[model samples]
Structure formats: C-alpha cells, structure tokens
Target: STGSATTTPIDSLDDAYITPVQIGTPAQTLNLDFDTGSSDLWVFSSETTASEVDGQTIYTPSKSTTAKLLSGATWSISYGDGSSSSGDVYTDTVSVGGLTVTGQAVESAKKVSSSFTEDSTIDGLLGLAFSTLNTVSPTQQKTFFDNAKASLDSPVFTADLGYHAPGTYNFGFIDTTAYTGSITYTAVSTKQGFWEWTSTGYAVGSGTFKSTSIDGIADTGTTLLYLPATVVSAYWAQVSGAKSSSSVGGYVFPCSATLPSFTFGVGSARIVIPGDYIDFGPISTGSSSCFGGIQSSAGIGINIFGDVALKAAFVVFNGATTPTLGFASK
Candidate 1:
C-alpha cells in the first residue's frame, strides 16, 4: 500500500524548514530539519552534554521500550558551513508524516557544534539524501527514506517549500495540486550521493537564457543560492550600489536598490525567481543595507540551489535506478 504524509514549515526561522517526526515506541515527536544536503539522521538526546543541549528537547532511549542500541556503531558529520555533530547509534521505529519505518538507524548526538546548540528550536536533522552518504562508521546507515522507500507507492518524494510561509513535504506520492503548469523532468547524476543536476543556463531579468551548463545540488539545508564567482558578479552588476563587502561578507547593497528577477533554465523550461525574493533581508534589524541571497560558491566545488532557489519551484526527487528531478512552477 502507498502512504503519504505532510509537514508544515517552522514558524520562527524562515531559513530552515522542519518537519515533525516520531521516534521509538510511545512516539516521542521531534521537529527535524529535513536536509537533502547530507545523509545522517541525528538528534539531540540524553547523550548530549548539558553544555551542548541548550534549550532543545532530548530523546532518551531508556524511556522507549522499542529503542535498541547498535553496539560499536558510531557516527560523526561536519557540514560545509562548519557545523558538526557526533554520536552513538540507535535502531527504532521512525515515522514522518504518517509513514513509519521500523528498525531505522537514529544517531543520538553526544556532541554538537555551536551552530546547532545555539538553534534550540531544531531538535535534529532528518537527512533525505542517498543512504550512501551516511556518516556512520563500521557500517553505513540507511536513511529513514531509504528504509521506507520499498513500501512506498512510488520511489519519490516532493518538496513544496514556500517563501516566508508554511510548505508541505509529501512522501511516497505527489500531490498534483501543489504546483501549476506541467512538470518538466531532468536526468540527475548522483555520483556524489546528492540530487545533482546541471542547469541548462541562467538569465538575469528578461535576458535570453545562456546555454552554460551549471552543475549544482538541490540542498534544502542550505539557506542561500550559490553559483560560480563570475556568474555571481554578473548578476550583481545589474543592481546599482551592489558590492562584495568584505566586512559584511558576501554581496550587499542599499535596501532601496531596485533588483531584477533571476531565471534558471531547467530542461526546456525557465523558472523565474522574483527580485523581491533575492533581497534576503536587512544586514541588521535596523540597517538600511540588505544582503543578496545569491552568492559565490567559491570554496565549494559545486554550486547549491538552496532554499532561496528551491522555494520558487515544486520539486520531485525520483529514486529510480536512473534518478531524475521533476520541477514545476509553484
């Protein structure tokens, strides 16, 4: 039988989208960041030290009769943003929306970086990437999605992220009402254990779409859209007063600057991101300067189509032998 469930976005932090997940027996619910960037289902737990716990909820296996320890198994991961976590492993029933996977690997974090400790609202990360990217040592772990895929009606999941509003993540089935127009598909190359694909090209404002092949990953955990340095510079040039600020970091411009919409080529379709969406927010609460959401992926080898970009489109991640990405205007 096919199963489906929906997750609404978190209210306070518009940067990261979260979903409610139930773990173990008796069902302890945690708001997990459904990250497509990495593969590791880790949570703040009783194992986390007091200093590292902050105000987050902790999951204790002792309280759950169904929780089992995976002897000698451990996991550790460091994100591209410098955030890191490490911990032991547990096997239990993991449920998201309404789909449940029994014996799913759950990593309980004993240590977490300041980035995680400071963000008290996020309980843990529910990785939606390929199982091969799991960080567990001794034996790699399968993500909850991986464990649940076989029983799903179809091997696919849809991400309908919204802008400053609640969105839904549908698993095992696609909701046609979530998008408009037709769904265009692009073949995905998952050599790096991610939903990696090449954009046909991009155009600033209403300009013609260049045929430049831009390789990037669709990363839900990432907050900003990142492209190559040259491409970033070209886009920012259109906005007067926009400059690469060393002190503020990335590109910043006057809040009054009129920005142009950005368009990306996917297959034969073009997804246009509004200029209003490109102006992320003020540099500070009361500052007259704003930060550009699109930045250069200088250090990172591949560009990232992060939340800023993905929120503009309805995305379908197909987990077939030859994976494909389906996109439609939201």
Candidate 2:
C-alpha cells in the first residue's frame, strides 16, 4: 500500500479567462501566468511584431491613464518553447481586485517569438513569484510583487485557480474556498521562484506516492504536465491493452479499460488531474486509445507540475510575508 496509486472550487474567474487581476486598483489589465518556477512580469506592446502573437493579448500605455515607460531601459524574456520577447521598460500604476500599487515596472517587447503570438486570452505575463529568477535586471529589474507589495495591505500574493480551465494561470489573490482550515505554508527555497514542493509520492487516482521517472519544475507558465518515460510507461501499463507508439513529439498510447485514480500529496494538500487531461487533445496515431497522462520528456530534466498543479490548489507565493510557499486544497 505504500506504493499505492490514487488521487484526486469556485472563484469569480468570470471572464477571468480574458481579464486577470491587474496589479493596482482599476489597474492596467495584464495577463499573468502564476509561475512558481521563475519570477518576472513581462508584457508585449504594439511594437512587438513578426511573431504569431495570436492568443496572447497586448497592452497599450495610451489606453491607461497611469501608464509610464521607463526611459533608457530595455527588457526581454526567453521561454523554453524556443520563443522570446524583447522590448523597453514601462512604469504603470496597477491594481487588482481591491488592491492598488504604483511605480510597477513592466517589460514592453518590440521583438517577440512565435509562441506568444499564437496564445489567446492573455496579453502579457504578470509574474507574481519572486526576484531570484527574474530576467530583467540592472536598471529595469523589478518584480511584480515587489512593486505591488508596497501598496498591498498584506505583504502576500496568492493564487486560486479552482475554476480555471486547463491552461488558466492566475496571480495576485487566493480564493478562500480551497482550504477547509488553516494551512501550513512551506518556506521557499532559494533556487527558483516556483513554489518547490515536497510530495510524498505519485498516484493514479488518490493518495499514492512512489518513485517514478517523472521529474520537473513547478511551472505556471507551461500549460502541460510533462511526465517521465519509465513512470509514464508504468502508468500506461494499467490501461487494458494500452500500447505506445510514436506520435506528437512523444510516446502515444490508448486504453479501453479504466484509468487508475491518482494524486500528488503536497503535505496535507493534493492535486488531481482528471481523465480528460489524459486524453491530451486526442491521439493522432489513429488508435482508439486516448493519449496517456504521461508524455516522453526522455532526456528532459526533471518532472514539471506546470499549470496543472496550480489549478488544483490555492497556492500562496509569500515573498513579502515570509520567504515561503503556502498551499491549501480546493
């Protein structure tokens, strides 16, 4: 039973898919990925062209009454997807929900990669994690929370992604419905801004932890959870007559039998990835098998929880209150 497999909220997310909580009150609308892996809030501008820039939204300084661009400062960000964005720095008075903050520094990119262009619903990235991994520095180095902390009543930034769709990542405030009682927040490690977790193990449906090949960083910016090869194979093994073959950049599998219930226990909290999450947009290999939850990151470093984990629980990136990451279940 020690290696047993297992697993398993509502927030105003209304139109939240398109509009996120800005840093200041009536703040400039900024799309954000509540990333724990890195800390840095970056945005795109009218200047950004040549890239897809489709689904990702853009912000106009002229659209907001309190927008200010930082002179003599430039910014850029490179994502693992091989896409990037670069632009100048801008200062704006931002607000989210009931909070107001000013002198917030943001990166306005003129040259962006294709990944940002194709993304939809979000305009910019408001990184509410920390300053350790921030890409912008020297003259323009400013963390979103750093600027917002000066104005926020509590020196805290939490995320509640209960109602969020698979890719939905939020920042600024946590929805209270996630926890049944008070939570024990973990102290943040200095290596990365992502709220590093100490999970007991992995599961198919509920409380199951075991040694698997899966390894990853807790990344909010990434939408999918990449599993390891060996564990991925073991998981697919459970499906009735599940078989693997080459497909979308990784191993593909289909099963007609029941999928196991699985969960990742972070202390007392848990995150569940539903059955649809396993399908992964339908297998193209032509087999009736839906893709297994695991993907082949073969040589890829570690297992990453990505946005999938953030949506399962209400997470607190408390750089201001304490150098700790607080977690509560939804």
Candidate 3:
C-alpha cells in the first residue's frame, strides 16, 4: 500500500490477529487473533483431549519442526465477545509466503471450551495487536507486536487481509495495485493506552452516499466494525433485506436479496466491503446466518473494526517509535 509495508488501524479494540502462514517440513494455516491488548500466538495442541476443541482453527506441533513448547506455561485469552480459550506457548519458525521469520511466537492450546474446541475452523491466534491488555502478562502489560517488533524485516509491516474477504488477509506482502490517489496519515499521540488512530472520514457504498461519518479509531480485537448507533440504524434502514433479529446477540438479515455495497473512507483511500461479506451466511440453522447491514455494538462504546473489516484492506502499523501511532498503505 505504501512505498513498503505497514500496519493499519483497527476500530479501537485491544486485540488484533494476523494470518500466519506456517511452513514446517510442509506447511500449516493459522488465522490468529492479534491483541494489541496482549502478546501471544497460541494454537490448539496435538496432545489436547476432552471434547478436543471447537470454533476457531487449530495448529498441531507435530506438523512443525520449529515448534518448541514451553511445557508448563498454560495460556488463555478472553475477548469483549464472551468467547475465550486456554493454551501454552511455543517458539517456532514461521514462514509467511516467501518470508521466513524464525523463533516467531506461537501458542499451543491443549484443552478449550466448546466454542473453540467444537469447531476447528481456526488453529490459533497470532496476537500482534497491542500489549497493555494481555491475558498472561506478568506485568499485566506488553504487546506481542511490541516484543516481535525486532523480528520484522522492516520497521513497517502491513496486514494485507485478503484471506477472509474472498481475497483478503494476505501476509508478508502489501499489494497496492488497486489503490488510487495520494494517501493521508495522522500521527498517533503518545501516552495512549491502546494502539489508535484518527480517520479523515468513512463511507458505506459510494463517495456521494455518506451514511455517517466519524473521525474515529480502528481495532482488530473486535469481532465487527462497530459504529455509532444512529449511523448503524440508518444503514439498516436503507438495506431492503436487512432486519433486526436477535440470534447472535444482536441484529441479523436474510441473504435472499442483493445487499447494497458499502465502503469506508479512511484518509485518501476507501476500504470496500463486498456484497458477499454483507451476505456471508450464518454458521447455524434458520435465519441467524443472514448478516445485518450493521450490528449493534455501540453499546460496548469505542468504535472498532474487527478482523472481518480488517480483511478488506492492507493495514500497516508503525511501532518504530513509542507513544504515537503511524500509518501508510500496505
């Protein structure tokens, strides 16, 4: 996105996730949650028992030669979403595409609750968000990104999230082929607790179609891109198929119709959300899968861009300096 690589700003949640391309003798996939709030890349262990694990995906150490577990140090992570997990740490060699980062941090979770243990969709989390809100911080602080800052090939790193949104969440590379115009940046102020930034503005579908605009922040730790209540309600009102239903703690919609396209205006660039993401089918029975144009999370306060939204753009976080936030295209 920028001249090189960089990290993007999430809504404002304490955590962030990166898609770690694990290449052992072979290779493995780990789309982990990155908590700027914490520092740790944990996965489900091969030796884990019980119901096993559910929800997110799991990474087995047997597949990796570089995987060296700490043995006795247990791990766990709790989120704004009631979902949580427990596991251990491992030092392994992780390769993202062609880039090889040795001794990369990893977590091997053995036993977990039904949410993650039941559905093995994700292996573990690549916690590179922030560190002040860690689950296992001995100092009750420290970000995985902060600790791993030295491992980066460059001071700048971009989260090319092309894995989740059809072509989102890409790693080790920031392709700005589609980006247009000059990008603007806001220097982050020091002394803040979270890794935050201010947006020039945000839009839903088109430039002229301004549903609601805000100069706010982005966070990867969140599950959805939270917006002000007024803006969220206004968005749903325009979408024909969207309706307020209580299935997943909030609003939901059906997929029978073509939902309107949406975009977010960040500085000079526009982050786009395709119709498929809006229509991403639910993971259960009935109309629960139908995605709402906007879910209600303002109740939680700070606006956040969860992993889903982060998957739509090439985000770079500049941690070369302390006490301030930096930005660029990835």
Who wins the lDDT comparison? 1
The residue-by-residue lDDT of candidate 1 on 20-82, one tens digit each, is 889989999888898999999999999998998878888889999899999999998999898
- List per-prediction Cα lDDT, in the order shown: 0.87, 0.56, 0.53
For model 2, the local distance difference test gives 0.56
Clashes of each: 0, 43, 67
| Prediction 1 TM-score vs. true | 0.97
Q: Please say which candidate is ahead in lDDT: 1 or 3.
A: 1
User: Relative to the unseen true structure, what is the C-alpha lDDT of residue 87 in candidate 2, on a scale of 0 to 100?
Assistant: 74
**Better candidate by lDDT, 2 or 3:** 2
Better of 1 and 3 by TM-score: 1
lDDT measured at residue 222 in model 3 versus the true structure, 0 to 100: 54
lDDT of 2 at 261: 47
Model with the higher TM-score, candidate 2 or 3: 2
Extract clashing residue pairs from model 1. none
Q: Where does model 2 exceed 4 Å of error?
A: 1-30, 50-57, 62-65, 163-176, 181-184, 206-208, 211-216, 241-245, 255-258, 268-272, 284-289, 296-298, 320-322
